[PDB]
Amino acid sequence: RIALPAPRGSGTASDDEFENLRIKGPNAVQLVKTTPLKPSPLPVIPDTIKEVIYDMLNALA
Amino acid sequence: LSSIPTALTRWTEECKVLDAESMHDCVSVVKVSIVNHLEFLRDEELEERREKRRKQ
């Protein structure tokens, strides 16, 4: 997500008018923030990928 | 150990070998889709923030 810079000044008529000018201005500094971690489940390994991984482990011996 | 190269470094090697100059072009093509989406969400969140301030 592109970052939101702090509210410069409370007040919508003046401060937010120049806050849209700043954040949305053609020339701006779009810093990045990460989203909060979503609870990813582990991907199931396909059987052929397990006959590829197992063949190296057998090559250990 | 930190000596083991990260996926990004292996992909970097792959990219170099398979496309030295076309990587920048793909970054530009994908950028066109990412920045537009993230700016849409930035403007929606910003509106939400102004709204919450007004309701405050």
Distance CA(B35)–CA(A2), nearest Å, equals 8
Distance CA(B44)–CA(B53), nearest Å, equals 14
How many Cβ atoms from other residues are within 10 Å of residue A19's Cβ?
A: 21
Please name which of A2, A9, A45 lies closest in space to residue B34, comparing C-alpha atoms.
Answer: A2
Distances (CA, A) of A56 to A44, A51, A60: 19, 9, 7
What are the residues facing A2 on neighbouring strands?
A32
Nearest CA in chain A to B37: A1
Q: How many residues does chain A have?
A: 61
**Nearby residues of B35 by Cβ (< 8 Å), 6 or more positions away:** A2, A30
Please name which of A18, A26, A19 lies closest in space to residue B46, comparing C-alpha atoms.
Answer: A19
Task: Give A-chain residues touching B34 at CB under 8 angstroms.
Answer: none
Quick check: A31 and A3 in contact, CB under 8 A?
Answer: yes
Distance CA(B24)–CA(B30), nearest Å, equals 10
The label of the residue with tokens 């410069």 reads A8
Distances (CA, A) of B20 to A48, B10, B11, B32: 32, 14, 12, 20
Mark yes or no for CB contact A4/B45 under 8 Å. Answer: yes
Distance CA(A30)–CA(B31), nearest Å, equals 13
| Residue B43: burial class (beta carbons within 10 Å; 0-12, 13-18, 19+) | middle
| Residue B38: burial class (beta carbons within 10 Å; 0-12, 13-18, 19+) | middle
Task: Give A-chain residues touching B45 at CB under 8 angstroms.
Answer: 1, 4
**Nearby residues of A3 by Cβ (< 8 Å), 6 or more positions away:** A30, A31, A32, A33
Distance CA(B43)–CA(A38), nearest Å, equals 23
